[PDB]
Amino acid sequence: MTGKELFEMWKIINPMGLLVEELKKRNVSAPESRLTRQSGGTTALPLYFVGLYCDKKLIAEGPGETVLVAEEEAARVALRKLYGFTENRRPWNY
Amino acid sequence: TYSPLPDDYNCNVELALTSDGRTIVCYHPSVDIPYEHTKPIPRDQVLKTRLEEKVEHLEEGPMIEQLSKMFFTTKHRWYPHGRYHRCRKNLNPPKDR
Amino acid sequence: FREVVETTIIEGRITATPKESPNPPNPSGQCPICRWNLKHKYNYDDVLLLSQFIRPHGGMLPRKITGLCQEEHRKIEECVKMAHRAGLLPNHRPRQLNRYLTRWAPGSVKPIYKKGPRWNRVRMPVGSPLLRDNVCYSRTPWKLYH
Amino acid sequence: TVKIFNITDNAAIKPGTPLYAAHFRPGQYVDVTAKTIGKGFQGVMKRWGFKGQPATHGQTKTHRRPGAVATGDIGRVWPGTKMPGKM
Amino acid sequence: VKCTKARYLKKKNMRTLWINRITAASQEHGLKYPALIGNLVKCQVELNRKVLADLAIYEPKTFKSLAALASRRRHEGFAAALGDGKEPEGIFSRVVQYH
Amino acid sequence: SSFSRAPQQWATFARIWYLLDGKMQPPGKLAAMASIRLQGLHKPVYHALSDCGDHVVIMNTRHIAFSGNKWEQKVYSSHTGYPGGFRQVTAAQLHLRDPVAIVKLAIYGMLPKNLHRRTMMERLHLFPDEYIPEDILKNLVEELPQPRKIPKRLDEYTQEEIDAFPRLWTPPEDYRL
Amino acid sequence: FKNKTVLKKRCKDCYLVKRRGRWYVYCKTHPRHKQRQM
Amino acid sequence: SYLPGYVPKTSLSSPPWPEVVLPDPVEETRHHAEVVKKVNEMIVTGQYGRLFAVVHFASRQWKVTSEDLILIGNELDLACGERIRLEKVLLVGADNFTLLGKPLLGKDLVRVEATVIEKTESWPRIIMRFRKRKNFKKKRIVTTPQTVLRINSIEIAPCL
Amino acid sequence: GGQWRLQQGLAANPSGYGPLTELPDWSYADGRPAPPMKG
Numbered sequence: 001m002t003g004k005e006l007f008e009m010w011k012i013i014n015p016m017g018l019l020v021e022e023l024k025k026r027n028v029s030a031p032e033s034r035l036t037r038q039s040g041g042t043t044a045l046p047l048y049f050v051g052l053y054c055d056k057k058l059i060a061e062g063p064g065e066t067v068l069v070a071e072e073e074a075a076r077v078a079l080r081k082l083y084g085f086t087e088n089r090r091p092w093n094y
Numbered sequence: 095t096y097s098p099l100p101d102d103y104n105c106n107v108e109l110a111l112t113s114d115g116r117t118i119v120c121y122h123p124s125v126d127i128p129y130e131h132t133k134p135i136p137r138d139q140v141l142k143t144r145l146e147e148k149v150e151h152l153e154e155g156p157m158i159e160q161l162s163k164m165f166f167t168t169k170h171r172w173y174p175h176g177r178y179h180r181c182r183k184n185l186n187p188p189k190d191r
Numbered sequence: 192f193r194e195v196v197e198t199t200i201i202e203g204r205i206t207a208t209p210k211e212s213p214n215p216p217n218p219s220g221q222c223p224i225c226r227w228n229l230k231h232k233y234n235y236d237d238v239l240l241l242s243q244f245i246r247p248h249g250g251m252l253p254r255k256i257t258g259l260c261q262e263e264h265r266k267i268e269e270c271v272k273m274a275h276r277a278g279l280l281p282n283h284r285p286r287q288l289n290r291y292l293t294r295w296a297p298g299s300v301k302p303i304y305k306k307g308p309r310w311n312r313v314r315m316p317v318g319s320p321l322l323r324d325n326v327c328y329s330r331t332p333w334k335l336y337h
Numbered sequence: 338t339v340k341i342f343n344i345t346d347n348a349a350i351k352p353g354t355p356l357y358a359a360h361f362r363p364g365q366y367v368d369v370t371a372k373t374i375g376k377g378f379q380g381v382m383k384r385w386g387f388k389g390q391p392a393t394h395g396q397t398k399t400h401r402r403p404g405a406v407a408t409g410d411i412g413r414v415w416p417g418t419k420m421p422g423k424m
Numbered sequence: 425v426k427c428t429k430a431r432y433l434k435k436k437n438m439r440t441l442w443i444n445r446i447t448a449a450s451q452e453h454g455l456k457y458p459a460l461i462g463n464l465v466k467c468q469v470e471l472n473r474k475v476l477a478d479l480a481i482y483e484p485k486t487f488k489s490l491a492a493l494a495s496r497r498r499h500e501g502f503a504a505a506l507g508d509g510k511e512p513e514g515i516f517s518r519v520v521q522y523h
Numbered sequence: 524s525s526f527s528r529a530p531q532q533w534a535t536f537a538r539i540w541y542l543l544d545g546k547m548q549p550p551g552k553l554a555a556m557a558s559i560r561l562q563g564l565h566k567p568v569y570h571a572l573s574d575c576g577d578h579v580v581i582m583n584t585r586h587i588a589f590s591g592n593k594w595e596q597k598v599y600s601s602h603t604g605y606p607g608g609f610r611q612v613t614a615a616q617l618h619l620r621d622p623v624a625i626v627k628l629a630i631y632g633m634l635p636k637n638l639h640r641r642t643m644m645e646r647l648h649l650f651p652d653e654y655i656p657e658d659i660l661k662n663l664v665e666e667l668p669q670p671r672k673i674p675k676r677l678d679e680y681t682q683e684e685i686d687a688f689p690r691l692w693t694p695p696e697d698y699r700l
Numbered sequence: 701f702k703n704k705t706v707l708k709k710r711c712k713d714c715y716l717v718k719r720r721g722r723w724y725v726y727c728k729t730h731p732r733h734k735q736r737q738m
Numbered sequence: 739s740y741l742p743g744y745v746p747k748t749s750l751s752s753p754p755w756p757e758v759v760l761p762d763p764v765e766e767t768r769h770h771a772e773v774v775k776k777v778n779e780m781i782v783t784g785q786y787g788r789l790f791a792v793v794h795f796a797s798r799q800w801k802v803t804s805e806d807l808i809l810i811g812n813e814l815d816l817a818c819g820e821r822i823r824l825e826k827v828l829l830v831g832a833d834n835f836t837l838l839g840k841p842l843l844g845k846d847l848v849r850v851e852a853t854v855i856e857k858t859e860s861w862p863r864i865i866m867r868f869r870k871r872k873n874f875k876k877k878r879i880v881t882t883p884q885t886v887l888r889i890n891s892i893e894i895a896p897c898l
Numbered sequence: 899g900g901q902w903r904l905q906q907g908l909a910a911n912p913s914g915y916g917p918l919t920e921l922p923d924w925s926y927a928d929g930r931p932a933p934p935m936k937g
């Protein structure tokens with residue numbers, strides 16, 4: 001299990017749906033996607049950082065080549081932070 | 095009222111020195127992008143909406159100049175390579191993390 | 192000051208003047224620059240001081256009237272020429288390429304067709320050896336020749 | 338053949354229109370452009386009007402040839418050299 | 425022969441790459457490379473250029489903290505040189521002595 | 524950051540469209556900072572085989588400034604290789620012919636002399652005036668600060684600093700001037 | 701004009717003027733005294 | 739009334755760099771105590787994860803983390819699978835805080851734990867010398883011994 | 899910073915007679931000191 005990512009081991013389909021279900025069941029307002037950062041946009045290699053906000057407070061941010069895939073990656077980052085599988089989490093104790 | 099660096103792009107950095115003076119303690123919580131600093135997200139009557147599948151075949155010159163204009167490169171990247179280089183290329187490269 | 196008017200009747204009249212600013216920080220100086228502690232602390236940008244020392248049509252004023260010492264007067268005249276060529280004095284005109292630090296008159300200088308070898312290169316002059324002795328505020332001195 | 342003529346905006350004519358010989362008038366001056374008579378591959382003598390070499394007086398197989406094409410110090414031939422080709 | 429001489433050139437080129445990346449990060453924080461290196465060795469952190477470039481790439485906050493420490497040491501040095509007397513030496517200009 | 528591998532790699536190695544202004548700036552300083560940005564030497568992830576260049580959009584290149592007499596001193600030399608192709612034009616003549624040629628040549632000089640220089644010059648974008656095409660304008664990020672300071676000619680000093688500057692000499696009352 | 705490296709006034713009416721980056725001796729009454737620094 | 743030493747505001751009467759005032763020492767030492775106590779209580783509660791360290795070992799500086807691998811270019815007189823403590827810790831850090839040694843951190847403050855997991859040799863390296871027209875040609879093959887260490891754990895203790 | 903190190907008395911190379919170069923690299927995890935290094 002050591003070197004792998006959460007959605008590399010457990011495949012999901014709709015991270016946005018899972019995220020809104022989790023926020024609803026822990027009594028958090030529905031997230032809003034906003035364009036935090038953007039480079040290119042008209043070219044063939046764009047860069048989008050989409051941030052997911054809740055009550056005007058940032059909960060996640062994600063990069064992508066398109067807006068939709070950036071929003072999906074931000075949803076996955078939100079799921080990671082909410083579930084405790086973040087990259088900088090405490091390593092396993094052996 | 096003094097900061098060694100501006101405190102609005104990466105982290106709010108505070109330097110400190112322990113009482114013995116033997117080690118330096120840094121505190122740097124990340125800065126978050128403000129909501130107000132963000133930007134809102136961007137947004138046949140009688141026949142089918144027939145799928146518009148045209149693929150015009152450009153000859154090599156026009157195709158390469160179109161690709162060069164698209165990706166901001168030269169033509170030499172798009173011109174092909176010989177069998178010697180094609181078979182010298184490693185098709186099972188090593189992969190770390 | 193003093194002005195002449197022409198109407199034939201011509202007349203010289205006296206107008207108001209500005210006097211010395213009240214308390215110079217160095218009253219023992221002999222030139223105004225020395226009195227105001229500006230000896231190596233001005234450039235061609237300082238059009239306040241330069242316009243204080245020029246005529247209304249862009250010419251310079253004499254050393255005796257200005258009270259300037261000879262070295263300061265020559266530095267003032269070179270700074271005024273460079274500021275005039277850079278276009279920093281749009282109201283002190285007589286009677287498109289952007290420049291600054293122009294030492295020679297632009298209409299008097301021949302192109303460097305044959306640059307030398309790198310031991311005898313024909314360099315291109317920037318600024319002024321009169322202003323060479325300015326305060327540096329850097330660890331590399333002024334490069335007078337490019 | 339189609340040809341492109343540079344005109345000002347006040348001389349625009351509707352496409353599909355006929356043009357005739359009386360478009361010009363006598364006592365005028367015109368410029369006439371055409372592809373010249375092609376002579377195929379020709380030597381220096383017909384192509385550039387070189388003088389060539391004498392016929393008799395000992396000459397070996399040189400009568401219509403270019404002589405020196407450059408100097409020895411130049412290790413090459415200059416671009417734009419007059420040499421045989423299509424005329 | 426090229427393999428051996430290239431061992432030498434590889435060490436040199438890798439140090440040049442580290443210096444380039446440290447200079448890039450320092451300019452990204454408004455600092456210059458000589459100021460960063462001299463101030464870190466004045467602050468007695470003996471991180472070499474390899475781990476400095478590694479921190480520049482992968483730990484931007486730790487590198488920002490190091491750049492802030494170096495800039496603060498620069499301002500202490502300028503203040504001491506300007507004062508020229510016997511003022512307090514500064515918080516981070518103190519030297520831990522060993523015996 | 525907890526990104527996935529492909530979005531993380533894309534975010535690290537993506538390109539940025541920097542903006543830069545002419546308007547009485549020296550083309551050599553413009554060219555130095557443009558050359559750094561075109562090579563990608565401003566990135567800590569830089570490597571010469573990583574193709575980490577960024578786009579640089581320089582405008583107002585018609586209003587550059589030469590220090591000194593470089594407009595008449597500096598000569599650009601080229602040779603159409605036919606015997607007699609040696610042409611030498613001053614910087615003034617080259618600027619009057621092509622408003623972007625001087626900045627283009629300075630950046631082309633400061634870029635490294637290898638096969639990547641032409642790709643970097645394709646990522647370079649130069650415009651002589653304030654007009655930029657709309658797609659490039661929607662691409663732009665980070666107008667970079669100008670290297671010079673625009674030394675602020677006499678008539679736009681406001682009255683506050685004009686009379687804050689003290690008067691250095693008293694003139695005689697009978698001088699004509 | 702005569703090209704000279706050292707310029708010498710030969711009249712009381714000669715005058716040294718620096719024009720187009722070079723020194724010149726101009727004489728109105730004796731035009732043979734025109735000298736051009738080189 | 740102008741001070742004896744006043745300069746009028748010209749382009750270079752004053753330094754180009756902005757004036758920087760440094761905070762007073764007493765308030766700064768109180769601020770240092772507050773920041774150090776804050777980082778210490780973060781260490782006590784455990785508001786951190788995935789520490790990294792810069793460790794001096796075998797004349798090199800390694801930026802290691804937990805569950806890591808490093809390759810030492812000499813033998814380490816240790817049996818395989820042997821747990822040792824790396825001690826010369828130049829840096830330890832987490833998200834939101836780092837600790838800096840001058841130049842080495844305290845052994846009470848930070849521990850690095852490593853495990854000898856492999857003792858091997860390198861691939862053969864060629865040393866060839868050639869000087870031309872002098873019949874000068876020499877070949878040698880070397881195999882440097884190596885030791886693969888797995889960095890297990892990086893632990894910090896509240897001691898600031 | 900060799901001149902600064904000489905002014906402070908801490909050699910010029912940081913790899914000379916300092917604690918950083920003269921302290922042991924490692925020790926056993928149970929606390930036993932390592933055998934002394936060859937250098």
Ligand SMILES: [Mg+2]
Pocket residue numbers: 388389390391392
């Ligand atoms: Mg004949």
Ligand SMILES: [Mg+2]
Pocket residue numbers: 397
């Ligand atoms: Mg025969």
Ligand SMILES: [Mg+2]
Pocket residue numbers: 396397398399
């Ligand atoms: Mg015959």
Ligand SMILES: [Mg+2]
Pocket residue numbers: none
């Ligand atoms: Mg070296």
Ligand SMILES: [Zn+2]
Pocket residue numbers: 221222224225259260263
């Ligand atoms: Zn004086």
Ligand SMILES: [Zn+2]
Pocket residue numbers: 710711712713714726727728729730733
């Ligand atoms: Zn005469």
